[PDB]
Amino acid sequence: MSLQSGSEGNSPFIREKVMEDGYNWRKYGQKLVKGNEFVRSYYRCTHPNCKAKKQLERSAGGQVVDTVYFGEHDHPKPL
Ligand SMILES: [Zn+2]
């Protein structure tokens, strides 16, 4: 059950407890690796003046096997 969900402590959303568009994320793009069998997706913070980036790895059947997050946010919620 944990593997299916809650596998990664660091997630884009917390307890889905969002007041309303608290965080703005924009899909960086999509890239296929080793054929359509393996694919990768890049995500970056929509908010300007932000170097925070997020990378998600998905393979046949979607699902995430590896999540990478780099950068810090000075605005936890919308201003
Ligand atoms: Zn930001």
| Å from CA of 71 to ligand 1 middle | 9
Experimental method of this PDB entry = NMR
- Detail the residues annotated as belonging to a binding site for Zn(2+): 45, 50, 73, 75
3-state secondary structure the chain: CCCCCCCCCCCCCCCCCCCCCCCCEEEEEEEEECCCCEEEEEEEECCCCCCCEEEEEEECCCCEEEEEEECCCCCCCCC
Q: What is the domain extent for residue 11?
A: 1-71
Please check whether residue 67 is in contact with residue 54, taking contact to mean a CB–CB distance below 8 angstroms: yes
Distance between CA 78 and CA 49 in Å, rounded? 14
- Residue 65 CA, ligand 1 centroid: distance in Å: 24
- The domain total for the chain is 1
> Does residue 40 sit within a domain?
yes
Q: Is residue 79 part of a domain?
A: no
Structure tokens belonging to residue 29: 């793009």
Residue 77 in domain = no
Query: Is 51 inside any structural domain?
Result: yes
Classify each residue of 32-69 as buried b or exposed e, where b means 16 or more C-beta atoms within 10 Å of its C-beta: eeeeeeebeeebbbebeeeebebbbeebeeeeeeeeee
Does some domain include residue 44?
A: yes
Is 31 inside any structural domain? yes
* Cα distance between residue 33 and residue 38, in whole Å: 5
CB atoms within 10 A of CB 76: 8
